[PDB]
Design a protein around this ligand. Structure first.
Ligand code: 7ZC
Ligand code: ZN
Ligand code: ZN
Ligand code: ZN
Length: 459
């Protein structure tokens, strides 16, 4: 059970309005043949054009919703819509382009897919709600054959050039005109009742239907994301490294230790309530405080209601001490909290568009995160940058320039002059802090938090 067999059945009911008379008995093999393609009994790494739900999940970063709406079928012009918000018009002779022949439209499709997927995936997965036109229009922009490598690098081939007879990946396809060996999945095969809008609108209110091909392409990918990442959650799937994944995770650990440690020194809470990751360890292991853990898995649909996390009768008195919500999304945080909430609006290679305002954050694992809402932090304020260190001033073992900063809470800075060791550690921590903030994370803390209370922790 590795790939989707070509001898698997394909439900043709959704295709009979664009293709009337389509036989009820259909296999993927017969479908691909009908689409104008020949697999020629090729055991060269491309066993089927269509892929399984399991394979689609592993290749989520390659997902591009695709829809084709007839404007007027070799006689009539077609509207090609993609989840990128692009709308191209092909002639046979919400960015809306005018009518142009297939030879020029295929060039634009290559450029668009390459600019979208070069820093995301090694392929493309056309996410369909197949009705006919999208499948029968693929022979005009897709070429297939054995698995190949790029003519300028070692990545797999994703494009083909009829001008130079060569193959390229998304990084080196400038001037390329055919999509080489794409993948696709028909969401309609998963067994649904009713049309795309009825199913999409059951879960999402952010994507509307404007009756343009790209709106359907958007609702299609959004629905597929809901079914595989919102209602069904598999955190055992590993995702390859494509960016600053390691620096981001490392920074999150350094920032959490710093924030939680300084908070316990400034206000000296008797007890900390650790609400979140059931696998969690104390982020500040040498703290005087009482560490109480409460298990909560990452919510993928709606943010937890603070009433169901705390009430229904644990210290029970969460009001005593401080609550720590590190990536645990709740509707409204109590006033005595320390919070790290991911901002779903962040633009990055790790963050993919989500369902109902949420985003799919892919860093080692896929986490669909509910929509960012600034009203959840009414009882808190944003946590400002600060660097704290009780460690001794001792350099050990990189060229220096004296550091002058009001946010370097150290004994040397208290004494008037920042030592080389704390200036080195401050600059590194500020880099990790900036890395984390830029990745989309947001820090919030109780209103009474004041870094001025850290200066007397050295006497
Ligand atoms: C710790 O961060 C990551 C992020 C993405 C990753 N993909 C593969 C690995 C390897 N890991 C299992 C050690 C990974 C780690
Ligand atoms: Zn290449
Ligand atoms: Zn949606
Ligand atoms: Zn120092």
């Amino acid at each position: 059970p590795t790939h989707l067999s070509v001898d698997t059945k394909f439900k043709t009911e959704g295709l009979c309005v664009d293709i009337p008379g389509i036989p009820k008995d259909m296999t993927y093999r017969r479908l691909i043949s009908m689409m104008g393609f020949k697999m020629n009994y090729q055991v060269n790494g491309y066993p089927n054009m269509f892929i399984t739900r399991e394979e689609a999940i592993r290749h989520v970063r390659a997902w591009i919703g695709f829809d084709v709406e007839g404007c007027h079928g070799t006689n009539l012009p077609l509207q090609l819509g993609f989840s990128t918000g692009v709308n191209l018009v092909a002639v046979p002779t919400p960015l809306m382009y005018k009518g142009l022949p297939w030879n020029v439209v295929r060039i634009k499709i290559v450029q668009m897919l390459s600019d979208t997927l070069k820093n995301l995936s090694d392929r493309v997965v056309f996410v369909l709600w197949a009705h006919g036109f999208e499948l029968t229009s693929m022979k005009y922009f897709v070429k297939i054959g054995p698995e190949r490598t790029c003519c300028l690098c070692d990545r797999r081939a994703t494009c083909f050039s009829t001008a130079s007879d060569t193959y390229a990946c998304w990084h080196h396809s400038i001037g390329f005109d055919y999509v080489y060996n794409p993948f696709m999945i028909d969401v309609q095969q998963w067994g649904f009742t009713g049309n795309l809008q009825s199913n999409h609108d059951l879960y999402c209110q952010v994507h509307g239907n404007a009756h343009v091909a790209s709106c359907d392409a958007i609702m299609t990918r959004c629905l597929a994301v809901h079914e595989c990442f919102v209602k069904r959650v598999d955190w055992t799937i590993e995702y390859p490294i494509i960016g600053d994944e390691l620096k981001i995770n490392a920074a999150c650990r350094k920032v959490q230790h710093m924030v939680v440690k300084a908070a316990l020194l400034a206000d000296k809470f008797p007890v900390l309530h650790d609400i979140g990751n059931p696998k969690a360890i104390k982020c500040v292991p040498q703290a005087d405080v009482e560490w109480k853990f409460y298990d909560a898995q990452p919510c993928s649909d709606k943010a937890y209601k603070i009433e169901e996390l705390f009430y229904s009768y644990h210290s029970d008195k969460f009001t005593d001490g401080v609550c720590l919500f590190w990536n645990c999304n709740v509707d409204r945080y109590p006033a005595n909290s320390i919070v790290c909430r991911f901002d779903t609006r962040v633009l990055s290679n790790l963050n993919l568009p989500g369902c109902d305002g949420g985003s799919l954050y892919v860093n080692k694992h896929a986490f669909h995160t509910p929509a960012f809402d600034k009203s959840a932090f009414v009882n808190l304020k944003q946590l400002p940058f600060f660097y704290y260190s009780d460690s001794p001033c001792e350099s050990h073992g990189i060229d220096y320039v004296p550091l002058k900063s009001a946010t370097c809470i150290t004994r040397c800075n208290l004494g008037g002059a920042v030592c080389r060791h704390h200036a080195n550690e401050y600059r590194l921590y500020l880099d990790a802090y900036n890395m984390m903030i830029s990745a989309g994370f947001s820090l919030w803390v109780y209103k009474q938090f004041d870094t001025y209370n850290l200066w007397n922790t050295f006497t």
